[PDB]
């Protein structure tokens, strides 16, 4: 046992490692979307910038979970970061819907992690999750939902000017 | 074929995708080392900071390779980022030796990529590799070799003060 | 032979003169597009400004090639700058497609020039081409491809608001 | 007929297109002279800089004529820019004499254009010519005459120090 | 073998050591010229300053090659720096011609070194040579050719005012 | 005889030329030590920086001596700069001991030169030596002796942390 470990269940450690992997995977998916929108035949610079920012924020979230794991004396065990489920995201609207789904799944994983921390009576872990990940996830999901709503109302993807003007105005 | 693609062989595209994956893997390995040195029972803050910086630089290298792939009209195809070969790096000296080996392998991959670009007469790709990756790799390998040499001479790992003072002076 | 001439093949000199002419011709074509978009019945100020900037950059490229020719002791031999293949570019999208084709042809000529310099073992000439023209051409071709993609998706030229809003947002 | 066109004769439009071509040709001749003086075996940096400045000013004059053509609703029709009558300008004094002759011919063409505008009672065109081109040409011709006079008195070209010290003092 | 050595042929190491010696020798020759022009019976302060600057730049080039040798894990092997071919450079024009010849020979050695690096497929070495030495050599040879042209046409050395005024104007 | 020469014996001129050569040789030896400590398997950055500074100071000393030679109307006669007695300096302590020996030998040569200037009653030369070289040599020898003493007491070379911490603290 780590000299610093206290009130840190093994299941919480495993859940934190899994969450680390999931945040790294979300960072990778956002990197994939940024790459897709930097394509010459997509060429939506602000979509690419937005998703690159999301990828960097996901990487920061994973690093914060790593710091938490070390703080509590748990041991980080890294897994393979699976490739994103696709390379062609096919539109700004589809990319935003997939990002919304990804943020909802990351939020569900964080909610399950908070439930586990609550069951194991790990108040520091619960507080960490709710302070640094749950509110961030709710804000991110709301922002992604707003983006999806606006893109759909604009007529995306069929309305060709829709994604371009959303890129300039909302994301630019 | 991409509207922008010109003098960009398919083998060069595949090699660039593989290099993207390798740079992402190196970033992941450096993140693993940073996590290891942030452990309470390792507690080498400057080793962790140095390897986190290496991880971020590797991620930037992968991002620049993907920007190159999009610039040339190639399509980025992301693969699984394999987990690092180990989670316990066991010492500052061992971590530096593994980082040296990783940078040498990344440099070897970049050299093979430059050879491929030369064979396909892709001067832009060759020049890009040279200006942004080969000199960086040579500098990184030299810095890692210096770190390893200094740690060895200081008596790392068995000289307990060696890694601590190297952390303070060289990496701090 | 020039007192400064060294490792500068006659074919390299001729290729550099031809490239000078081609860059001057591209500058002239971009001037033609700028003139077209300054027309009262086209009236796309940012398209005109963008293509005038391209014309000035092309003139700078030709002047840099002339400076290179004098640096290496070759003699600049100027030819007629042929008129652009048309005076009516008929749309922002068509002008962007023609600019993309022109930059691709300039890049192809630069690639052939780099191949010639490589065959004649003129490393300074190869390095000059790849440092100052190849990366610039790749960036320009990518930017033009992005412009063309965005204009096409916006519905240009048929979508009358497409070129106007692209002029304001992307080019303004 | 252009929506903006009024009191703009077809002959004025053709004369403006011809003047555009002539100004582009003068810019090209000045570029040739700048290139000649950048030669290693001529090596008069201030002569080259002076003639490059003349080339850029000629290009600006051509661009202003194009702006005038579009302002009046005339259509710019670009022609081949003929190569300068020679590549070897053989001296600072000879280059200055050729520049003087070129500016006198450009001024003669501008005077014929002003006569045409006067005959067709195009007061805006006459005023444009006289405010932006005639005074500029008179000043340029006077400056070139001064340069030629000083170079001749200094003993150019046979006086070896003459062109060097003129380059340093007058043009530097 | 050095821990950092990778894709660094022994012939490249030997060629780099020879180039180091040649750059040190060129620095020594430039120091000799600076000394000659600081003589009371020569007394060309700007010629001496120019050649001292050349000597310092040559020493910097040798030091950069030394840094490259250490970066690649090659071992620097210093040789005797041969005395310059003469102590009396006899004139500003003769010194400039000898400097031109020396820079051309250094450039030839660098070109052979780049050819060797190309044959050994050492892209980092080729890139290093071309980015830091080949363009510098071309610029230096062009500047020296310009100096020689101006001095010759000013009447140097027989025209006694020629070297003095070149010292004041071009070199001052 | 030089027009400026006065009270400047031929033996003093020869001794000054020999001192030129000796200072250039010391600069070369210090460059060799700097190169040795920049090696990846030595990797003592501050030792390398210190010895590079010593090399540059030795070059400045030689340059000052040749300025003195020209000031007095003597003629500088440069000789071969012999390669340093070794390429492998094997240690920070050994390099410091060799630097101490080299500074002591340079000081002995300067003392013999001052004795010669005294015998020839050349008060300006004696004053120059004592003002610019003797005090500098005494300070340098004392600093090198301090460095050697501290390295020996620290346990260099066998104490592996000794040279590293001396590099950080004294030389950093
Ligand atoms: Fe300490
Ligand atoms: Fe809008
Ligand atoms: Fe003067
Ligand atoms: Zn990398
Ligand atoms: Zn170009
Ligand atoms: Zn004009
Ligand atoms: Zn050099
Ligand atoms: Zn000294």
Taking the mean position of all CA atoms in its chain, how far away is CA E141? Answer: 9
Q: CA nearest B71 in C: which residue?
A: C142
- Say which residues have a Cβ less than 8 Å from residue E75's Cβ, sequence separation at least 6: E2, E13, E69, F39, F87
The CA distance from A159 to A92, in Å, is: 12
Q: Is D61 annotated among the ligand-binding residues?
A: yes
CA angle F35, F37, F40 (to 5 degrees): 95
Q: Is the peptide bond before E157 cis (omega within 30 degrees of 0)?
A: yes
SS3 per residue for chain A: CCCCCCCCCHHHHHHHHHHHHHHHHHHHHHHHHHHHHCCCCCCCHHHHHHHHHHHHHHHHHHHHHHHHHHHCCCCCCCCCECCCCCCCCCCHHHHHHHHHHHHHHHHHHHHHHHHHHHHCCCHHHHHHHHHHHHHHHHHHHHHHHHHHHHHHHHCCCCCHHHHHHHHHHCCC
Is residue B13 a contact partner of residue B66, using CB atoms and an 8 Å limit?
no
Positive or negative CA dihedral for B37, B43, B46, B47? negative
Question: What is the SS3 assignment for B82?
Answer: coil
For chain B, give the longest Cα–Cα distance. Answer: 60
Interface test with C, best of D17, D26, D35 (most C CBs within 10 A): D35
B81 forms beta bridges with A81
If one counts every other C-beta atom within 10 angstroms of the C-beta of residue B47, the result is 28
Is residue A95 a contact partner of residue A32, using CB atoms and an 8 Å limit?
no
Is residue E129 a contact partner of residue E114, using CB atoms and an 8 Å limit?
yes
Taking the mean position of all CA atoms in its chain, how far away is CA F66? Answer: 15
Positive or negative CA dihedral for A125, A131, A137, A142? positive
Contacts of B73 in chain C (CB under 8 A): 142, 145
Q: CA nearest E161 in D: which residue?
A: D161
Residue at token pair 């006459």: D126
The CA distance from E131 to E117, in Å, is: 14
- Say which residues have a Cβ less than 8 Å from residue A141's Cβ, sequence separation at least 6: A100, A103, A104, A107
The partner residue sitting opposite E108, judged by closest CB among C2, C6, C70, is: C6
Question: What is the SS3 assignment for D105?
Answer: helix
Contacts of E161 in chain D (CB under 8 A): 161
The partner residue sitting opposite C155, judged by closest CB among A40, A161, A168, is: A161
Chains D and A touch (3+ CB pairs under 8 A): no
Q: Is C58 annotated among the ligand-binding residues?
A: yes
Written as six digits, the tokens of E76 are: 């620097």
Interface test with A, best of B3, B76, B79 (most A CBs within 10 A): B76
Q: CA nearest E81 in F: which residue?
A: F81
The partner residue sitting opposite F160, judged by closest CB among B147, B153, B170, is: B153
Are E104 and C2 an interchain contact pair (Cβ–Cβ within 8 Å)?
A: no
Cα F17 to averaged position of ligand 8 atoms, centre (Å): 13
Is residue E129 a contact partner of residue E113, using CB atoms and an 8 Å limit?
yes
Smallest CA-to-CA distance from F128 within F54, F75, F65, F78 is with F65
* DSSP H helical ranges for chain B: 10-37, 45-71, 92-119, 123-129, 135-154, 160-169
Q: CA nearest B103 in E: which residue?
A: E4
Contacts of F70 in chain E (CB under 8 A): 35, 38-40
Is residue E52 a contact partner of residue E31, using CB atoms and an 8 Å limit?
yes
Burial of B89 (0-12, 13-18, 19+ CB in 10 A): buried
Are D160 and E153 an interchain contact pair (Cβ–Cβ within 8 Å)?
A: yes
Are C87 and D80 an interchain contact pair (Cβ–Cβ within 8 Å)?
A: no
Q: Is D54 annotated among the ligand-binding residues?
A: no
The CA distance from F156 to F151, in Å, is: 5
- Chain C neighbors (3+ CB pairs < 8 Å): A, B, D, E
The CA distance from B68 to E94, in Å, is: 50
DSSP code per residue over E62-130: HHHHHHHHHHTT-------BPPPS-S---SHHHHHHHHHHHHHHHHHHHHHHHHHHHHTT-HHHHHHHI
Contacts of E153 in chain D (CB under 8 A): 160, 163-164
Is residue B28 a contact partner of residue B136, using CB atoms and an 8 Å limit?
no
The CA distance from D172 to E84, in Å, is: 36
Residue at token pair 């530097």: D172
The CA distance from F60 to F79, in Å, is: 17
- Which ligand sits nearest to residue C63's alpha carbon? 5
Length reported for chain E: 172
Q: Work out how many CB contacts closer than 8 A connect E with F.
A: 82
If one counts every other C-beta atom within 10 angstroms of the C-beta of residue C2, the result is 17
- Say which residues have a Cβ less than 8 Å from residue B118's Cβ, sequence separation at least 6: B126, E121, E123
Determination technique for this entry: cryo-EM
Are B149 and F45 an interchain contact pair (Cβ–Cβ within 8 Å)?
A: no
Fold annotation for E10-170: Ferritin (1.20.1260)
Written as six digits, the tokens of D111 are: 């005077």
A81 forms beta bridges with B81
The partner residue sitting opposite B142, judged by closest CB among E4, E126, E127, is: E4
- Which ligand sits nearest to residue C113's alpha carbon? 5
φ/ψ bin of E90: left (φ > 0), alpha (ψ from -120 to 50), beta (otherwise): left
- Which ligand sits nearest to residue D110's alpha carbon? 6
Smallest CA-to-CA distance from F77 within F86, F64, F66, F91 is with F66
Q: CA nearest E171 in D: which residue?
A: D168
Q: Binding site, residues of F?
A: 23, 58, 61, 103, 137
Q: CA nearest C123 in E: which residue?
A: E130
- Which ligand sits nearest to residue F169's alpha carbon? 1
The partner residue sitting opposite C80, judged by closest CB among D40, D78, D82, is: D82
Taking the mean position of all CA atoms in its chain, how far away is CA C136? Answer: 10
CA dist list (Å): F81 to D57, E55, F33: 55, 15, 16
Contacts of E127 in chain B (CB under 8 A): 130-131, 134-135
Min Cα separation F50/chain B (Å): 17
If one counts every other C-beta atom within 10 angstroms of the C-beta of residue A10, the result is 9
Min Cα separation D61/chain C (Å): 13
Are C124 and E115 an interchain contact pair (Cβ–Cβ within 8 Å)?
A: no
What residues does each domain of chain D span?
Answer: 10-170
Interface test with A, best of B4, B40, B73, B89 (most A CBs within 10 A): B40
Contacts of B72 in chain C (CB under 8 A): 138
DSSP code per residue over E116-127: HHHHTT-HHHHH
The CA distance from A24 to E13, in Å, is: 43
Cα E140 to averaged position of ligand 5 atoms, centre (Å): 25
The partner residue sitting opposite B138, judged by closest CB among E2, E72, E121, is: E72
The CA distance from F100 to F29, in Å, is: 12
D81 forms beta bridges with C81
The partner residue sitting opposite B148, judged by closest CB among E3, E71, E126, is: E3
The partner residue sitting opposite C4, judged by closest CB among D40, D52, D76, is: D40
Contacts of E166 in chain D (CB under 8 A): 164
Positive or negative CA dihedral for B107, B108, B111, B112? negative
| Residues of chain A in Cβ contact (below 8 Å) with chain B | 2-4, 24, 28, 31-32, 35-36, 38-41, 52, 59, 63, 66-67, 69-70, 73, 75-84, 87
- CB crowding D47-64: b at 16 or more within 10 Å, else e: bbbbbbebbbbbbebbbe
Are D31 and C3 an interchain contact pair (Cβ–Cβ within 8 Å)?
A: no
Cα F26 to averaged position of ligand 8 atoms, centre (Å): 8
- Chain B neighbors (3+ CB pairs < 8 Å): A, C, E, F
Are F164 and B153 an interchain contact pair (Cβ–Cβ within 8 Å)?
A: yes
Q: Is E90 annotated among the ligand-binding residues?
A: no
Written as six digits, the tokens of E47 are: 């010629």
CA angle C135, C137, C140 (to 5 degrees): 110
Are A35 and B77 an interchain contact pair (Cβ–Cβ within 8 Å)?
A: no
**Torsion over CA of B39, B42, B45 and B48, rounded to 10 degrees?**
-70
Question: What is the SS3 assignment for E60?
Answer: helix
Are F161 and B149 an interchain contact pair (Cβ–Cβ within 8 Å)?
A: no
Is residue F16 a contact partner of residue F120, using CB atoms and an 8 Å limit?
no
Interface test with E, best of D161, D163, D172 (most E CBs within 10 A): D161
């Amino acid at each position: 046992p780590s000299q610093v470990r206290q009130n840190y269940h093994q299941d919480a450690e495993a859940a934190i490692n899994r969450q680390i992997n999931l945040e790294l995977y979300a960072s990778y998916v956002y990197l994939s979307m940024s790459c897709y929108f930097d394509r010459d035949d997509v060429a939506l610079k602000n979509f690419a910038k937005y998703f690159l920012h999301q990828s960097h924020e996901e990487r920061e979230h994973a690093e914060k979970l790593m710091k938490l794991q070390n703080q509590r004396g748990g041991r980080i065990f890294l897994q393979d970061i699976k490739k994103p489920d696709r390379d062609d995201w096919e539109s700004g609207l589809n990319a935003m819907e997939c990002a919304l789904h990804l943020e909802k799944s990351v939020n569900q994983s964080l909610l399950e992690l908070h439930k586990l921390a609550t069951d194991k009576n790990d108040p520091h872990l619960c507080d960490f999750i709710e302070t640094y990940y749950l509110s961030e996830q709710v804000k991110s999901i709301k922002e992604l939902g707003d983006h999806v709503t606006n893109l759909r109302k604009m007529g995306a993807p069929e309305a060709g000017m829709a994604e371009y003007l959303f890129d300039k105005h909302t994301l630019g």
